Design an enzyme around this catalytic site. Structure first.
Site, PDB file in Angstrom:
ATOM      1  N   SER A 117      70.766  82.934  61.805  1.00 53.91           N
ATOM      2  CA  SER A 117      69.869  82.904  63.150  1.00 53.91           C
ATOM      3  C   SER A 117      69.550  81.843  63.769  1.00 53.91           C
ATOM      4  O   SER A 117      69.887  80.587  63.098  1.00 53.91           O
ATOM      5  CB  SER A 117      68.414  83.854  62.685  1.00 53.91           C
ATOM      6  OG  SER A 117      67.532  82.665  62.134  1.00 53.91           O
ATOM      7  N   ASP A 122      73.170  80.536  54.239  1.00 56.99           N
ATOM      8  CA  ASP A 122      71.836  80.842  54.695  1.00 56.99           C
ATOM      9  C   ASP A 122      71.196  81.771  53.524  1.00 56.99           C
ATOM     10  O   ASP A 122      71.865  81.941  52.301  1.00 56.99           O
ATOM     11  CB  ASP A 122      71.574  81.740  55.668  1.00 56.99           C
ATOM     12  CG  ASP A 122      70.377  81.310  56.699  1.00 56.99           C
ATOM     13  OD1 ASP A 122      69.528  80.879  56.011  1.00 56.99           O
ATOM     14  OD2 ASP A 122      70.282  81.685  57.912  1.00 56.99           O
ATOM     15  N   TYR A 130      56.254  68.638  59.506  1.00 58.29           N
ATOM     16  CA  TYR A 130      57.427  68.874  60.432  1.00 58.29           C
ATOM     17  C   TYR A 130      57.809  67.454  60.962  1.00 58.29           C
ATOM     18  O   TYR A 130      59.103  67.393  61.002  1.00 58.29           O
ATOM     19  CB  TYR A 130      57.081  69.889  61.592  1.00 58.29           C
ATOM     20  CG  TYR A 130      58.513  70.533  62.001  1.00 58.29           C
ATOM     21  CD1 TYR A 130      59.329  71.407  61.475  1.00 58.29           C
ATOM     22  CD2 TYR A 130      58.945  70.078  63.260  1.00 58.29           C
ATOM     23  CE1 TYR A 130      60.335  71.948  62.057  1.00 58.29           C
ATOM     24  CE2 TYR A 130      59.742  70.599  63.725  1.00 58.29           C
ATOM     25  CZ  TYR A 130      60.771  71.342  63.161  1.00 58.29           C
ATOM     26  OH  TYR A 130      61.971  71.847  63.612  1.00 58.29           O
ATOM     27  N   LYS A 171      61.571  65.804  59.942  1.00 57.83           N
ATOM     28  CA  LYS A 171      62.380  65.414  60.900  1.00 57.83           C
ATOM     29  C   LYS A 171      62.772  63.954  61.163  1.00 57.83           C
ATOM     30  O   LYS A 171      63.598  63.497  61.462  1.00 57.83           O
ATOM     31  CB  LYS A 171      62.164  66.101  62.354  1.00 57.83           C
ATOM     32  CG  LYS A 171      62.090  67.541  62.166  1.00 57.83           C
ATOM     33  CD  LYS A 171      63.368  68.073  61.275  1.00 57.83           C
ATOM     34  CE  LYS A 171      63.533  69.667  61.681  1.00 57.83           C
ATOM     35  NZ  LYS A 171      65.148  69.844  61.214  1.00 57.83           N
TER      36      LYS A 171
END
Ligand SMILES: Nc1ncnc2c1ncn2[C@@H]1O[C@H](CSCC[C@H](N)C(=O)O)[C@@H](O)[C@H]1O
EC number: 1.1.1.35
Lengths: 284, 255, 255, 255, 255
Positions: free
Chosen positions: C14, C35, C162, C166
């Site tokens: 996805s 996945d 998050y 990152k």
């Protein structure tokens, strides 16, 4: 010293003798305890002047040659500073090699087997060998094992490198290679080994004995390996070369250049390029 | 000024953390040394006098940091500054084709745990302690100073685990500053270069000498008291927030 | 070109990962969708033809990735490209004084485990598989492309976990690129902005349309196809290495 | 796609500019080489066929650029892409204590005139030409690509003037992208590293090998064709705006 | 400490320059206000006591700076610190499609000359004066502090000229730090954002009062004294070199 009692007619006698001598040179003269040994040393001491002045005469002859042309006769991206930049680049590569590079050991335990001529020559090959490691794409982690701090070999290395000795990116130590590395991974390279080196192994520590015996002493490196329980290997010179001339014991600068080529995925055809061509008649 | 402030220093038993405590205490502040029980921080805390105590805690554990903060609040009543200096490193390539070695997952995990989440473990817990403070005239409740590295920008060979953790601190510096901006808490990050700390001392002495000479100016390893000076400057400057300050002497690390 | 190349796209069932697989397979390459078992990648792999195979694996576990790469080696015989598109997100403030709510350490650890630890785990194991490949005419053995959004640079309120993950990917992009330079593997990082991933289309139209209008130009959410285009451009350019590329339409996230 | 687009390439008679024109014309676009009259632009434009013309102009002069843009409109009817590759380099130390030599101000001004001032002079004029275009399906009117350098991030010794001019291009790329966003014009910047331009290839073979070895991977100077490839990728990708892309093979220049 | 140091403050008659001189003179240093003849710097120099002198000079003029530097040599004997604070601004946009208005070339040239070329003009001339100083115990001959802006990173609409000049200062701060490293001169850059200067009073008050709320924390305009405090911090820290320090209160400038 009374040792002048030989030189002061050996010049008039007609033999080749240098004109400038010092007490330090005079001292080493009296260790030569035979006529031939003294003659051989004096011949070496004489030819030192012969090439010095010949190269000396060459250089200021060039000085007049360039000074007349230099005096009578834009957009850039980089300043001309490449020798500085190259040295720094090799320094960063050497620092990385000292952490993750493959260890290579030069065994310094041969001081007792070498005369003064041989010991001095060992340093010269050591200087060139370490120089080729610096310029390589994937340098080794060079170790100087069994190097006594006060020993004759250490003092000569310090004299040649001068200030650079404390700044070299290599690990010099008093301890033996068996103390630093597992005895299973150590492979003592020697020409007298019965086992032929087939492939370069990246999980092994290769030991090169820094021994230059112009008075050749076979089995000295093998005896040290068999005094311990170290494994040994020999280069496949007979397998890939048609030997005719000279000793099969290569120099330290040739050995490290062969190992470096093998470590960089080179085959034996490229690796044995550094064996002197005067000793064989082509690769087969 | 810094006098009268209470500072919680993680990894304050040695290295940059200890130098920060020496300067802040010497300037009239109160410090709490947060480090491992076996780090020997008790001797350091006694050496710094009555204004410094030792809180044995592991930053990676939520309960341990909560005990330390309660100890700091019990001794001094309030928490004004949090300095995150606790960190570890490994020297391991991601993959060594010649030797056939792959970077192990535990080494990457443990560096990330101590350097990155443990830093975040302290930040979220002490911000609650700063959240109880009454605002000053500028409306400020506390200052949180983190410790990244130049590896977060130019990591060396074999520094992937170290650079990922320190890189994370740089990435979350601004979002946390925005998160705590409503409640008047400043979050700043320092990215020291080569410093005379045991983390870099573990390298061979000849490698350390070469690295020290490569710093453009001053051509020496960073002295830890100069790190402490920058921390005091961040504490005293009300307008420094959400920025990473490189303290490396203009060095850029080649691979 | 990319014809004949074998690409392993993590999180390819996805979002950005699926779009990358459609473009690469459509261009003549072969894709291995890595996945979660419940992600429905089997349906996507069947739609993409016989050149695409689904390998169910959890990137956080070394065992699952090893079996997944063994399946990629079995089906296509070699691995040439690794595209790390697998990722999760959590929206939680570090500390809310009005509510007395603290960021949960499990939430912070969970995001790091998938976004940061999973990316490195794939990289370190994939680099072993590209290490077996023979260098091409340019000496290249493979390309690794990581995904690390613009939150790594300007994260928003409540995005500390998050941004930390990152920020870690961005920080470690260069050291890994230097690690694999002797091998011949290029490591590149893409920083997507707001993209029309199933995550962004889930939230209500109010924040969906407002954020799309916040992009300077084009004033819309990023098409995942545009992400796939830049992924292919990195693969085809031999000189792109150790660089973070922002794909956001020049938007700078306000607090 | 790039077929049917018209590209104005400053400094397009040699180096990166010539490589960009060769690829775009080959792909089916039309190019206008905007370079100095003394350059071999006339020969280069003839070699590329009827789809490429040479417009002599000095980027530092407003009048010269306007005549060049008028020529592009006359020959092709519209302007779609502007590539700013024109620029000069000067190596000079800021101050040399031993030699008593101080950096000359006129050296600083001329580099800033061509690299920084010249780039913006083209941008402000070519933006008006794209402002006359009808937006395509995406609402876009044109793409502007500037050429900074890696010196904008890690400038070497003697590159004070060059880095300042290239650093300014990195400075303006986002504000200009914000200015032209309502119009629908994208602004992007490429930062090439060491490339095989005539400037570098004229150096002695001894230093050419060293510069090639300094690149982590690939260990060679950048192919100008690789710069052209990335220029095309930016043009085709609609979501690349206001971002600086480093195309240097992960090199970080040492002092 | 900064006691006894002689600082040449460029543009020190108002704003950041005057605040820097105010703090340094108060701490015991000597200051030289290098500003324009019509700036009213003579009043400021008198108000600061006998330790401050006024040197009327245009930073774009080589002759003016040399006479001003010679005045500092005559009055104080040596130059120890240089702070470049003079700068102008322009609010013109690159191109306005609706009004058919293009950014005039002279506005970009004028801003670049004062901000970028003027800063370098002072740097290279003050480098010769600092090169005459005896190296101190740390081997340092002087410190050069430049003032970039936040616009060098996230410049707003209509700030193309300002971002270019400020981006150039950020671009050249490292090469100059590398150029002057053998001499023993540290080059550091400050990037203030939205300070309570006359610059942030020319804009409409409602706009200005709105920007004060845009800063996350402190939610106000930066006090010029806070800039002066950071300058003193950079002077007293021997390891700060070649870095750009953002002093903005964690604000990221919206379009
Ligand atoms: N053909 C060969 N194969 C492997 N190693 C060799 C070699 N020739 C020389 N070497 C290495 O080069 C070094 C110097 S050659 C001297 C060897 C020693 N004098 C002896 O007689 O045995 C030795 O340590 C040896 O290990």
């Amino acid at each position: 010293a009374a040792t002048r009692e030989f030189i002061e007619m050996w010049r008039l006698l007609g033999r080749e003798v240098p004109e400038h001598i010092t007490e330090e040179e005079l001292k080493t003269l009296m260790e030569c305890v035979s006529n031939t040994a003294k003659k051989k040393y004096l011949k070496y001491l004489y030819t030192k002047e012969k090439v010095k002045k010949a190269r000396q005469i060459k250089k200021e002859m060039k000085a007049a040659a360039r000074e007349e042309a230099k005096n009578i006769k834009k957009n850039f991206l980089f300043l001309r500073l490449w020798d500085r930049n190259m040295d720094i680049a090799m320094g960063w590569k050497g620092a990385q090699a000292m952490q993750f590079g493959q260890p290579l050991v030069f065994d310094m335990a041969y001081e007792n087997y070498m005369k003064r001529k041989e010991l001095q020559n060992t340093v010269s090959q050591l200087l060139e060998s370490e120089g080729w490691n610096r310029r390589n794409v994937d340098p080794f982690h060079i170790y100087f094992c069994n190097l006594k701090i006060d020993g004759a070999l250490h003092r000569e290395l310090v004299k040649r490198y001068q200030e650079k000795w404390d700044k070299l990116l290599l690990t010099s130590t008093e301890k033996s290679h068996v103390d630093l590395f597992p005895k299973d991974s150590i492979i003592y390279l020697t020409a007298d080994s019965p086992n032929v080196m087939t492939t370069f192994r990246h999980d092994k520590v290769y030991v090169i004995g820094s021994f230059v015996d112009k008075s050749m002493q076979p089995g000295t490196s093998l005896a040290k390996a068999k005094r311990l329980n170290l494994a040994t290997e020999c280069l496949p010179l007979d397998k890939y070369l048609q030997w005719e001339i000279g000793n099969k014991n290569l120099t330290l600068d040739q050995m490290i250049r062969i190992l470096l080529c093998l470590k960089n995925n080179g085959n034996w055809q490229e690796a044995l390029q550094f064996v002197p061509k005067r000793k064989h008649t082509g690769f087969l | 000024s810094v006098k009268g402030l209470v500072a919680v220093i993680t990894g304050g038993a040695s290295g940059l953390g200890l130098a920060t405590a020496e300067r802040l205490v010497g300037q009239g502040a109160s410090a709490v040394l947060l480090d491992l029980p076996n780090s020997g921080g008790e001797a350091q805390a006694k050496k710094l006098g009555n204004n410094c105590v030792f809180a044995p805690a592991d930053v990676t554990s939520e309960k341990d940091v909560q005990t330390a903060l309660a100890l700091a609040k019990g001794k001094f009543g309030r928490v004004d500054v949090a300095v995150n200096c606790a960190g570890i490193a490994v020297a391991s390539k991601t993959y060594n084709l010649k030797k056939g070695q792959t970077h192990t997952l535990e080494d990457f995990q443990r560096v990330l745990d101590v350097n990155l989440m443990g830093t975040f473990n302290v930040i979220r817990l002490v911000a609650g302690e700063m959240g109880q403070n009454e605002p000053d005239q500028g409306g400020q409740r506390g200052v949180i100073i983190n410790t990244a590295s130049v590896a977060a920008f130019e990591g060396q060979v074999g520094q992937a685990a170290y650079s990922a953790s320190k890189g994370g601190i740089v990435g979350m510096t601004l979002p946390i500053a925005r998160d705590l901006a409503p409640i008047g808490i400043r979050v700043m990050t320092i990215a020291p270069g080569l410093f005379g700390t045991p983390l870099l001392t573990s390298l061979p002495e000849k490698v350390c000498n070469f690295l020290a000479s490569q710093v453009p100016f001053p051509s020496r390893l960073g002295d830890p008291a100069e790190y402490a000076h920058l921390v005091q400057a961040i504490i005293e400057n009300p307008f420094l927030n959400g920025e990473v300050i490189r303290l490396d002497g203009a060095i850029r690390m080649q691979p």
